[PDB]
Design a protein around this ligand. Structure first.
Ligand SMILES: [Cl-]
Ligand SMILES: [Cl-]
Ligand code: NA
Ligand code: NA
Ligand code: NA
Ligand code: NA
Lengths: 408, 408, 408, 408
């Protein structure tokens, strides 16, 4: 009976823009029980939608939803063309939806299914950003009042019009995919390297040593430049220095690790354990940032987290607005169970987004609390979602001062 | 309500000898739901019984049985003294019992909880043993008739009174822990190395190429000797050559791997991922043999299997009579889910043992079929168990012809 | 004037099924000169179509088509999510179209633009397949008569219903994407390993030593199994043994290379130099198989070929029916220039496909001859393409005899 | 027709001394279209002239000038004796001339042929030199006024009569090949190591942090001495520290890289990718300095630049007066296309030299702008060249204070 009940009756995607674009996969079993999974890939959303709609969804009909592992392998190996952002996001969406269903069928919140809670709450960090160091400091003050124990700090660089994590116009909400076609930013590494240490010095001067302070380099340096920055910020004891260098070549982290004791984080642009196996095994990083939606879902990320744990590496899930509350809820469940949890990024969604994706995770005093509802605790209001049609938005590109297409 | 229901009400060990010694841990929740886990460590049984009774059991009372991960870490890290056969067997017993409870609470057979089935049945191998090559061949014929697709072959060595996997007296059941104090066997490596290839040649001559043929070297060689044996048996295409050399020093496998393409298996004497991380990552073995009871249970073995999968290594759980049907049932569930399954060893328990541990796993046509009952599908009949009091039995020791204490 | 003339006026995809699905990108400059690039990703075609239509195409309008390098980096880095089959196929399509335009603007066939011809013709291999070894031998005889100097041989395995490269029904054309949803094949490694050497032995017996003989293992083995096969086929001196093992973990090739001198080829499932940098630098392969359409186009594949050349590795472009004549024409141009050319796969397209994509490359006496028309020498007949609507077709999946989802 | 037109009609060298010696190769096709390439090897000029005149030129007559790759391999492999400064400079001259012809035939400036522009202008550095630190500072001030964003600084060492990059007599133009036979300089490493940091400290004090500051160690240190210097100048954040140690043994860079985060540049004395493959792959340098004339031309340097790009290494072409405007023009084209451009050295030629080699590259506000004329945009006025006969000039040698022949 349970098998017939777990047979997939229907599966389909939902595309909505309640503040920004989200793509969601819904899987409905013969029992009526459904699961949903995040399928949002910022700036390439419709590639994943088509991957799902045309190629994956039709193969899901009639399958046993209880066979999570088999389905993961069927889609991963069966695609023939393996790994990649579009590929692994589609697989993650299916996987997340199937774990949602399994937890509902078991009558348990997801964290219970994974092995139970390892912690009573989930520490987060907030994005503190400003045009000037002082503007950023004001935001740090604000978030400490909200109870955040950890903050990521980003401020504008003098001589540079636009830099990562800083809004074009003060007060306004930072949402990077801000244009139909990519905005074009200009970059100077040398000016940034001379300025960045001043920001952390100021944070420590005003806020002291107890605050966890994070910084995202956002792919812009070469290894020896990142080594230099790491050394320069050692006195400020950062929680992490993130995305120092593009790391398709994983050996790129070696020179940084050999030259600094500033902790390193990487991985939000990764989608496979094969993108980071060497980074982990060689102890070149301290935190792995690959999130559920882009990293092949729960099934794959359990394996990544477990590999990390052998080398003292901790989880630091990417948590921007462009991963939906479906991912965030599942992530908080995962974060609640995983032994080697590090931190959870929190970039709050719009009220409109929260309304479209009702959920039972809570934020209190700087931390997340996992929901107790069976499933990952998130759902989608299809009627409300239909009120916000897709609107194309691309991520910016970054060029050097001479026009060289660089890393954003 | 569910939390109060999952609080541990009672926990205790049961020691029974229905043909041979088994130690079992039972954990009972406030709800009345119980779980059991195998705690049998052959020839050192009472060390684990005491580890549990005096040190672990009292700390379990009042704990939330749903917190599998936290309990595993609490016992593993909290012991202060980490790893080891007594230590990890006690932890495995707790872990297996807690997964049993979790599956019962979820109303699912264990394999469903792990991620669902990856296969429709679980291939096994049988022990085919004989005094002479011909005696062994008779046993191979017999087991093929029973539907086994895979056989482990062991035969006596001329000039050697006693060798591994061969009974002292024909027909009689091989049960290695055959004496109160250790029996003393005599060994000659050179005679074995000259004889062993003749056994495999004979198996191939009589049975052809389709049969999977396994052999256990049982720790007796040095690396270059195992390399020689591996090369000599290449024409017979063994499924694996197992336990070639003692491997506390994991580098011991290197020379074998560099010199032969005969597949290698190791790990029944291991208890930690730290015993085999390097063997796996360096691709020095093809099959990892560490079983649930001795390898820290489901929680730990999922991590071992997942690490193995990155390097094409497959599972080959040790499955002797000295792991109870509790372990075997849990193993069959694990085997049913795990993507990188290789084979399951089958050394059938006595009828008396099967009666003491009722179970829902089935053997059909050379394969195991996972049970469908919630839990791992095994229980223990305490009243029947009480009829078979513990009887001390030790594993043999092996000496060279000059009296040197060697490896059994 | 030339700049205004090279400004992109229009860009769009064309989807057609003249025997099987192809997706093509067309870019039209203000001058009227257009270029086309292959964007076909077998079994996931619409993912690439959407990636292009919704995200890439709109950003191409108004760009200078002459800026090939800048565009490649703009799309590769600017996507933020880097590498992957959908991603790199879209980029390849743009790149191929821009090189087509550049060659037309220069009034030269593509090979001239790349550095001129290094050879007078391009050696190919044909697919020789059969149910039995004898059936395969008949096909070898047939293709030798056509002038092929090199043949890939595949035959059915006894005890196995379906194997790679062998049609379900004799005589009929092998086209793997044969079903709307994936067909399900069954596999036995052990039966294949025992049979495969017999095929090569028979080819050498009937055809002698001068013929180049290739074989595709098609991802089905573990490293030590591939090592065994490599050793077993050494006496038959294969041109290559292809795709021995799945290689997301590039270290997977190490054991094979250490144990056999049979030449190794890999890479048709790769899309990035980062998928194979280590395979090349460690000299673990002899031929790199990644083709233009899937490997990021001319711009990226020049870099891959050049890296290969430092380590004596040669090109062996994947050339199945599911890369369009657009790719094949561009490939023949590339093959004509590249110093370290190895061989070009030839799986002839249908007449209907050849009609839809008129081209000036020629096949004569077992070899390709590059076209002399400016561009890569291929075009698309949009009117004729419109007569063959898309029809969904997926690649098969492969399961072991126990049902384990394996590698097809 | 195009083939007959591209057949080489004539080829010859031109030797001229309009301020210093240059050797140029001219290749004339049947169409009348010609190309030129730089063949200048400072202090050994006539070795290359003879290599070309007697051995290469006669083999060029009748060849198809369009076959750039084939010609490169024909000369590189066909020489039998491979690599080396005389050898690779001759090959570069041919290669540069053939790319000039190809671009003219395509009706495009060279950068368009290479893949189009990656940047709008090419950043340079100037040589700022002085007897004293103050003299050097005056030159820095002067060049900043001219718009240079980057300066190389060299000053005399107290207790040392002569050092690299400093003229014997103030104001006068530095042209190292200053004598018929080698001048003999005296060197003290210890005095230099104690003085050099004072120069950079002074530059930072007077000019601040925005200026890019470079320094050429010019081969004089051992690895641990260079490590010491690198560490000592970290506070001054140099753009690069160049040629720290002689690097025929590429491992020489290891100790420097392990001990300092000052960026490293090397390669002006190299002529082959085989001189620097390991330096690049091990990430021991940040900038590769090998230029077109000495590094086998465009064909070879594209491959070097591409290898560098995999490891974040950028181009920093050697650009002294002893590479002719032919090389500089080709270099600016290359610099305009190459993604991983770092900087272009600018040591301005004499007016007489500029007159002999008319060109369309421009210098504006510290940067080069590529020409737009088909070809590399440089030509040679043979009539004017004939007015300046060759005059032998050798590079200096450097001895330690005890007379030991050292590295200049
Ligand atoms: Cl112990
Ligand atoms: Cl992808
Ligand atoms: Na980041
Ligand atoms: Na064993
Ligand atoms: Na293949
Ligand atoms: Na230098």
């Amino acid at each position: 009976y349970f098998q017939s009940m777990m047979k997939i009756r229907d599966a389909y995607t939902i595309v909505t823009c309640p503040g920004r674009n989200f793509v969601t996969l819904k899987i409905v079993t013969e029992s009526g029980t459904h699961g949903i999974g995040d399928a949002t890939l910022n700036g390439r959303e419709m590639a994943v939608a088509a991957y799902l709609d045309e190629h994956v969804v039709p193969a899901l009909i009639g399958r046993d939803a209880g066979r999570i592992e088999d389905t993961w392998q069927y889609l991963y190996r069966g695609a023939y063309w393996r790994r990649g952002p579009v590929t692994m996001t589609a697989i993650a969406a299916v996987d997340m939806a199937l774990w949602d269903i399994k937890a509902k069928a078991a009558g348990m919140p997801l964290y219970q299914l994974l092995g139970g809670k390892s912690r009573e709450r989930v520490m987060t960090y907030a994005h503190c950003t400003g045009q000037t160091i002082e503007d950023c400091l004001g935001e740090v003050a604000r978030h400490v009042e909200l109870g955040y124990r950890a903050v990521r700090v980003q401020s504008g660089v003098p001589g540079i019009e636009t830099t990562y994590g800083v809004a074009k116009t003060p007060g306004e909400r930072y949402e990077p995919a801000d244009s139909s076609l990519p905005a074009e930013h200009v970059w100077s590494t040398e000016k940034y390297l001379n300025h960045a240490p001043k920001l952390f010095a100021a944070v420590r001067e005003r806020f002291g040593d107890d605050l966890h302070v994070l910084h995202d380099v956002h792919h812009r340096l070469t290894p020896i430049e990142a080594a230099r920055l790491g050394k320069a910020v050692e006195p400020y004891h950062l929680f992490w220095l993130e995305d120092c260098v593009p790391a398709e070549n994983q050996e790129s982290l070696r020179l940084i690790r050999e030259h600094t004791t500033t902790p390193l984080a990487i991985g939000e642009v990764f989608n496979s354990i094969h993108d980071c196996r060497e980074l982990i095994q060689n102890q070149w990083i301290d935190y792995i940032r690959m999130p559920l939606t882009h990293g092949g879902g729960i099934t794959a990320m359990r394996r990544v987290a477990d590999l990390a744990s052998l080398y003292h590496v901790r989880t630091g899930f990417h948590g921007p607005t462009d991963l939906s509350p479906v991912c965030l809820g599942a992530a908080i469940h995962f974060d609640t169970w995983v032994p080697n949890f590090g931190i959870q990024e929190h970039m709050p969604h719009t009220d409109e987004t929260d309304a479209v994706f009702p959920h039972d995770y809570r934020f209190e005093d700087g931390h997340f609390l996992a929901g107790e509802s069976p499933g990952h605790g998130v759902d989608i209001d299809e009627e409300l979602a239909a009120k916000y049609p897709y609107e194309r938005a691309s991520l910016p590109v970054n060029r050097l001062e001479d026009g060289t297409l660089w890393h954003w």
